[PDB]
Design a binder for these strands. Structure first.
Ligand SMILES: [Ca+2]
Ligand SMILES: [Ca+2]
Lengths: 62, 524, 348, 48
DNA sequence: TATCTCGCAATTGGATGTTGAGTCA
DNA sequence: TTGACTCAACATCCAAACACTGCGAGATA
């Protein structure tokens, strides 16, 4: 459901756009030795090019 | 610039011994590297020797009569007569090779004889112009008959191959001696060259199909042909000569780009003396050398290899026990009674396999045992450290002291059993020792339905997932003051949780999101 | 710091802590002890009790004391009665102390003989003329309205992180290297310290740093001349004071401990002695305007007037406008520092 | 100096002579080197 | 008188092998 | 010309688990 998807998309610490720092926080905490230049997923996720991932782009990545 | 061109012309008048361990390791590495390079040189030179352009020229050096002698008719009644004719051909080939070469050059600097560590150290100090030798140069030199003894013998092998005889190039590889731990490694200048060239680095082997043996041929230096049984005229003898010619890697290259370690033929004491001076003296160097050979051995095994291996096996059988105590230190097959470790026993029913007359004491004799007859024992704890427990009603074979003393019992491998740890529960719960850890010193010690995940954060991960695990004590760190410490290098979890854990330690978008989804369905 | 420079061999002076177990009741020679081990509630192990038993056993003919005022005199009197010594000694630090009870520790030990006349000591050549200065760096309108919206500690994160402070720090860093003077910066915050220590290329000694990397910088500071600007937290000042570096820069300052910063700054100036003709020991404080830290830093300079040290005010030195190497001078870097500080306030 | 004011000896002072005849070059070279040797003798005398 | 900080408490080794130098028979 | 000694200075192998946080010093608006 939409509620479930927003919850999945609302599992961070802001609630505003997924920022690089937010993705980094998640990837760092789940164990991920990822370079600052290892955005990859999030980087490619950026459809409109604003350097972040909004709800619609998150949905499309999933 | 101006002093570089215009030379200053003036009249300036003027009236223990063991290196560090770092040098030890540097010498071992440099020894390996150098050996490999030499063996590759022998391979490539053997290629050059196979050159067709050369063989069509050298073929014309061998009269028909001699070709027939090199390929005698098979003699049924008495194959030896054929061997005879073969040897006569090889001799005549050797004679006409002297006619062919004429000019022999001296080695510019020790040729490929062994160099000292000091020499290698100072070689980097001063650069030198080197006239390059390309394949074409080699061919031209061999055809004109001009060059040092190595190029000479190489040409000879090429001639024999031109005449379709199965002739090997033999190279006694002389890397620097990694056993020589001296700092100052100076050599006696008296008759240095003559002693260096007393025995050759390259020679030839020819297969005799009638007697089924390799015949040794040195047509340049010793100018002889021999059928080596136990003794070879080509192994260097005398302390002087063995300072630049230490026989330990005699390598054979054949028509078909084969590469075989043939030292056994030329070394009387392969197993006792030479082994000490070879990189193969320990398991790692053994595997390393086998890897190099294989890398240079570009053909399938033949029946000849089988024959030569039988020859080597007989040479091994008949080398026997060495004449001296030193040569039995770390011998691959034998041990002196007095060298049996406190933690070893003679296998039941076995005894000595020979004796040693001790040089220096009248009638003094030492008992020599085959190593195959010595069994290694360990205590119960030591076996647990190898993932083994004792069988029911096992009796110990030896009792030995320790420190504050203590009587430790020792058991044989046959008295021990493979330890099987209890399985994890359905939920994946591991059963752990008194400290709350699982001891995992051997793969055997992992539960059948579990896996070991080794990672600095595998614990933080398993705790974070709230899943069932057990910290893994994989070894013991020995540290300052007086106290041992367990090394908790990771986690034992059930198998079905491996990837969950790996995600936890490891963490695309979907993976990161799903782990978030799990973390939340788990916390609350 | 001194007793091996002094003639003392610590082979006999076993140090007892009730944790640093040492040789008691077997020390062939004199011992060095502490009030916490000698008589305090911090009797974690019976090593202290055994040391006291041995002290009772041997009639210790003399006692050396350092800063007993802090420790209450009750334990002092208890151990005086317990040990029954022959003589003692008080190396006091303050004229009036909390241990001036009815039974004065003077008549417990002895009369006064010398007074630590700091006007006699602090003027003949050791401090090399303290020059207390406070660099009045400007602040910004984006960090001020965000400063007023924060309170209860999470507000000092906007005060310390200022773009003009990096322009005043890299200017005073390049100013001291032209005069051939080493720099020994001090701070309070942990995080805000590593962010200013990593970008300037100045090794660091901070909390929970391994000692193999801690002593390597001291070998690159006392021998190598390439490291003339070190960054120390609170560990490298309460453990070893350096007699070099005649230029000190204070950046991160905590409230309340302005007298503890005065005890730390005073121990550096007392360590710097060689009696030079100039010997100008410069002290700077990068205080931003209209912040709650500069008004507490005036209490720190007020303690220095009580010590007799002269304090001057430096608004800006005419030379920072000609340094192109000042980071966060461009407004783009000031907005990038604003976003890095806004992420720091979201993490704290 | 060394371009700042600290003394150095980057190169030693020397004279550049060009020769055209071989006998005269041999003679002048041998004479000059002999003079250099005698000079070493005299300076050895003087340094004592 | 309530509040933080923050220190503090809890000198691998000993047995065994390798190396080169030297001495002896 | 051989090797078995001894000497001394290293090198190298091998044994094999306690916890972790409370608690008083100074200082504090
Ligand atoms: Ca966000
Ligand atoms: Ca976007």
């Amino acid at each position: 459901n939409l509620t479930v998807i927003d919850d999945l998309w609302s599992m961070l610490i802001r609630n505003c756009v997924l920022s690089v720092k937010d993705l980094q926080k998640i990837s760092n905490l789940i164990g991920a030795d990822q370079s600052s230049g290892t955005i990859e997923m999030i980087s490619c996720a950026t459809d409109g090019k604003r350097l972040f991932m909004t709800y619609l782009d998150f949905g499309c990545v999933l | 610039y101006d002093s570089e061109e215009f030379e200053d012309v003036t009249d300036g008048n003027e009236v223990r011994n063991v290196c560090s361990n770092e040098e030890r390791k540097r010498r071992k590495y440099f020894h390996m590297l150098y050996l490999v390079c030499l063996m590759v040189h022998g391979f490539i030179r053997n290629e050059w020797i196979n050159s067709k352009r050369l063989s069509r020229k050298l073929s014309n050096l061998v009269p028909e009569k001699v070709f027939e002698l090199l390929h005698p008719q098979k003699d049924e009644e008495l194959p030896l007569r054929s061997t005879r004719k073969l040897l006569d051909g090889l001799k005549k080939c050797m004679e006409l090779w002297q006619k062919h070469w004429k000019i022999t050059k001296k080695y510019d600097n020790e040729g490929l004889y062994m160099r000292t560590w000091k020499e290698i150290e100072m070689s980097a100090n001063n650069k030198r112009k080197f006239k390059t030798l390309k394949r074409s140069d080699f061919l031209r030199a061999v055809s004109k008959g001009h060059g040092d003894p190595d190029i000479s013998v190489q040409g000879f092998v090429a001639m024999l191959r031109a005449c379709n005889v199965n002739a090997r190039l033999i190279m006694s590889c002389q890397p620097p001696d990694f056993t020589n731990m001296k700092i100052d490694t100076s050599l006696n200048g008296n008759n240095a060259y003559k002693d260096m060239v007393k025995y050759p680095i390259f020679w030839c082997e020819v297969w005799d199909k009638f007697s089924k043996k390799w015949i040794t041929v040195d047509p340049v230096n010793l100018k002889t042909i021999e059928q080596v049984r136990l003794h070879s005229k080509l192994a260097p003898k005398g302390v002087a000569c063995c300072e630049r010619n230490m026989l330990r890697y005699v390598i054979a290259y054949d028509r078909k780009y084969g590469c075989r370690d043939v030292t056994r033929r030329y070394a009387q004491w392969m197993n006792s003396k030479v082994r000490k001076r070879r990189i193969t003296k320990d398991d790692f160097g053994e595997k390393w050398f086998r890897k190099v050979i294989t890398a240079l051995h570009h053909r399938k095994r033949t029946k000849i290899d089988d024959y030569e291996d039988q020859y080597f096996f007989r040479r091994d059988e008949s080398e026997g026990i060495p004449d001296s105590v030193q040569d039995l230190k770390n011998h691959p097959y034998y041990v002196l009674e007095q060298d049996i470790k406190q933690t070893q026993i003679v296998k039941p029913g076995c005894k000595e396999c020979g004796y040693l007359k001790v040089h220096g004491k009248v009638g003094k004799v030492l008992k020599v045992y085959a190593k195959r007859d010595i069994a290694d024992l360990k205590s119960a704890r030591q076996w647990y450290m190898n993932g083994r427990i004792l069988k029911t009603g096992s009796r110990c074979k030896k009792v030995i002291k320790r420190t504050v003393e203590e009587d430790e019992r020792l058991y044989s491998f046959e008295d021990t059993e493979l330890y099987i740890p209890p399985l994890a529960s359905a939920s994946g719960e591991i059963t752990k020792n008194t400290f709350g850890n699982i001891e995992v010193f051997a793969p055997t010690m992992i539960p059948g339905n579990c896996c070991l995940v080794e990672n600095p954060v595998a614990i933080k991960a398993a705790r974070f997932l709230g899943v069932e695990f057990a910290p893994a004590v994989t070894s013991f760190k020995f540290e300052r003051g007086s106290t041992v410490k367990p090394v908790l290098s990771g986690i034992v979890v059930a198998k079905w949780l491996r990837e969950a854990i790996e995600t936890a330690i490891d963490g695309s978008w979907n993976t990161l999101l799903l782990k978030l989804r799990i973390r939340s369905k788990l916390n609350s | 710091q001194f007793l091996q420079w002094c003639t003392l061999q610590p082979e006999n002076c076993a140090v007892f802590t009730s944790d640093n177990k040492e040789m008691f009741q077997t020390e062939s020679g004199l011992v060095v002890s502490t009030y916490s081990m000698v008589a305090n509630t911090r009797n974690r192990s019976h090593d202290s009790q055994k040391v006291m038993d041995f002290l009772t056993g041997r009639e210790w003919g003399f006692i050396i004391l350092d800063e007993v005022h802090v420790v209450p005199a009750a334990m002092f009197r208890r151990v005086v009665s317990t040990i029954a010594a022959h003589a003692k000694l008080g190396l006091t630090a303050t004229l009036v102390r909390e241990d001036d009870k009815i039974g004065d520790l003077n008549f417990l030990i002895g009369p006064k003989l010398y007074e630590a006349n700091w006007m006699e000591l602090s003027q003949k050549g050791h401090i090399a003329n303290v020059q207390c200065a406070e660099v009045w760096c400007p602040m910004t309108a984006e960090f001020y309205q965000e400063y007023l919206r924060e309170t209860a500690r999470k507000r000092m994160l906007l005060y310390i992180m200022n773009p003009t402070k990096f322009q005043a720090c890299q200017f005073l860093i390049q100013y001291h290297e032209r005069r051939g003077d080493k720099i020994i910066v001090f701070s309070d915050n942990v995080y805000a310290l590593q962010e200013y220590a990593l970008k300037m290329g100045k090794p660091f000694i901070y909390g929970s740093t391994p000692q193999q990397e801690r002593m390597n910088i001291l070998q690159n500071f006392q021998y190598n001349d390439q490291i003339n600007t070190i960054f120390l937290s609170k560990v490298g000042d309460t453990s070893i004071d350096l007699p070099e570096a005649t230029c000190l820069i204070q950046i991160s300052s905590h409230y309340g401990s302005r007298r503890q910063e005065a005890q730390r700054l005073g121990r550096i100036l007392r360590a710097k002695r060689r009696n030079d003709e100039g010997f100008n020991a410069f002290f700077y404080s990068l205080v931003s305007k209209d912040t709650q830290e500069m008004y507490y830093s005036t209490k720190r300079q007020a303690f220095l007037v009580d010590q007799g040290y002269a304090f001057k005010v430096i608004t800006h030195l005419h030379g920072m406008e000609n340094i192109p190497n000042l980071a966060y001078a461009s407004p783009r870097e000031r907005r990038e520092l604003l976003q890095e500080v806004l992420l720091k306030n979201e993490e704290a | 100096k060394d371009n700042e004011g600290n003394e150095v000896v980057p190169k030693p002072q020397r004279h550049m002579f060009s020769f055209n005849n071989r006998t005269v070059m041999d003679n002048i070279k041998m004479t000059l080197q002999q003079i250099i040797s005698r000079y070493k003798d005299a300076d050895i005398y003087e340094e004592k």
